[PDB]
């Protein structure tokens, strides 16, 4: 009997742009890029959901305004799973740590940048800040794309594998192959 462990799932992380960017005029300026990022992230989330459906049939602090709109969507349904969880948490923690950076601005908050600095320079400053946070989210989206491709390949492999006795596991499955 040989035991093998296959990842099936990854934590669904959706982003709402309305409080991630923010007035409601910054949303009009910066909504397109964040809309592509949000659409890619919900594509990743729906991909993970049908991965679980096909195979089977900051996360501690979150369990939304405190995290700048960076939420975790709960799904409707031992080494490799530990890497999946650890690098997912590393990606999310790196993202949260990177929103805390000022990104070269006079401050990392939107209240102070409209307070002690003039509007015709504040427009450039706020552009730098919000577009930098959006590029950080772009880097997170790219990492989730490549990792979602990896767990996608593993999920189709597990679906083709589904004598053998299966058991559920956190974000994955385990197979007992009797031979």
């Amino acid at each position, epitope marked *: 009997v040989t035991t093998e462990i296959l990842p099936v799932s990854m934590t669904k992380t959706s982003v709402d742009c309305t409080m991630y960017i923010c007035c409601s005029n910054l949303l009009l300026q910066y909504g*397109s*890029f964040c809309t592509q990022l949000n659409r890619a992230l919900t594509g990743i989330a729906v991909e993970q959901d049908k991965n679980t459906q096909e195979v089977f049939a900051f996360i501690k602090q979150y369990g939304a305004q405190k995290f700048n709109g960076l939420t975790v969507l709960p799904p409707l349904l031992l080494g490799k799973l530990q890497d999946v969880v650890n690098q997912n948490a590393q990606a999310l923690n790196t993202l949260v740590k990177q929103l805390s*950076s000022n*990104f*070269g601005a006079i401050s990392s908050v939107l209240n102070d940048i409209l307070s002690r600095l003039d509007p015709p320079e504040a427009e450039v400053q706020i*552009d730098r800040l919000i*577009t930098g946070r959006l590029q950080s989210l772009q880097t997170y989206v790219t990492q989730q794309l490549i990792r979602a491709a990896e767990i996608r390949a593993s999920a189709n492999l597990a679906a083709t594998k589904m004598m053998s006795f299966p058991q559920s596991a956190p974000h994955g499955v385990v197979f007992l192959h009797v031979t």
Partner: antibody, heavy 122, light 106 residues
Framework: QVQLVQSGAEVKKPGASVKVSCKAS????????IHWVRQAPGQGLEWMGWINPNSDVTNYAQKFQGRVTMTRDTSISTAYMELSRLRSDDTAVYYC???????????????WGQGTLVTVSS | VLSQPPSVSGAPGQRVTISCTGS?????????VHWYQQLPGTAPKLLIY???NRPSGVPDRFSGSKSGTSASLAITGLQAEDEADYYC??????????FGGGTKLT
């Protein structure tokens, strides 16, 4: 791969304006940045200005304030430069560069464009 | 804005350093200094990003560092291909990028 390609050369006379176009391919034109930097022949690079494709807010240098208007067209992924009121000192190669992914403050110009020679003389 | 030496020379095969001196508002403020190589007749190519990091397609002989209001590039083992224009840059408090002068390593 990512490539930035420019239009042809211009032999615009003094008093006119340029329409130097920068087509960006291989990457999402929404996001990142499009900077314009000119180089006079025989001298070093001096900056002109950056446009952000998301918001169309500019940042010119203090020398080029009021004469240069960067416009972006995200449908064709192309950044137009309009340097109005040319003089004889504006004969230069007008490079189009792309700022890289910003981590902990602003970063380098990861890819550079082709060379547009704008010569201005009688 | 950034002050650099006009040109530098040297025989092939040894280490030579070029500098990049600026004010406290653009290097001393903590902004990343970047270095660029321009071969004659072509667009300048990325040489050093992130002040010490090295991108792909470029060998390890190029190196860079900062200290306070200064930055420095060094080449180890120079050859007949490395004679090209070099530039340094930094961002300021208005986040307006400033290029240094052209250094003619010849």
């Amino acid at each position: 791969q990512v490539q930035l390609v420019q239009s042809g050369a211009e032999v615009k006379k003094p008093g006119a304006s340029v329409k130097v176009s920068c087509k960006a391919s291989g990457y999402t034109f929404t996001g990142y940045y499009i900077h314009w930097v000119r180089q006079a022949p025989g001298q070093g690079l001096e900056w002109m200005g950056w446009i952000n494709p998301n918001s169309d807010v500019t940042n010119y240098a203090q020398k080029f304030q009021g004469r240069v208007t960067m416009t972006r067209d995200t449908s064709i992924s192309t950044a137009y430069m309009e340097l109005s009121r040319l003089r004889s000192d504006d004969t230069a190669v007008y490079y189009c560069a792309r700022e890289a992914t910003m981590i902990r403050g602003p970063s380098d110009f990861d890819y550079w464009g082709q060379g547009t020679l704008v010569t201005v003389s009688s | 804005v950034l002050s650099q030496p006009p040109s530098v020379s040297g025989a092939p095969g040894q280490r030579v350093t070029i500098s990049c001196t600026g004010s406290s508002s653009n290097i001393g403020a903590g902004y990343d200094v970047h270095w660029y190589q321009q071969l004659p007749g072509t667009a300048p190519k990325l040489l050093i990003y992130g002040n010490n990091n090295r991108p792909s397609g470029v060998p390890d002989r190029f190196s860079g560092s900062k200290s306070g209001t200064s930055a420095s590039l060094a080449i180890t083992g120079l050859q007949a291909e490395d004679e090209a224009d070099y530039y340094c840059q930094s961002y300021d408090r208005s986040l307006s990028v400033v290029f240094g002068g052209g250094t003619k390593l010849t």
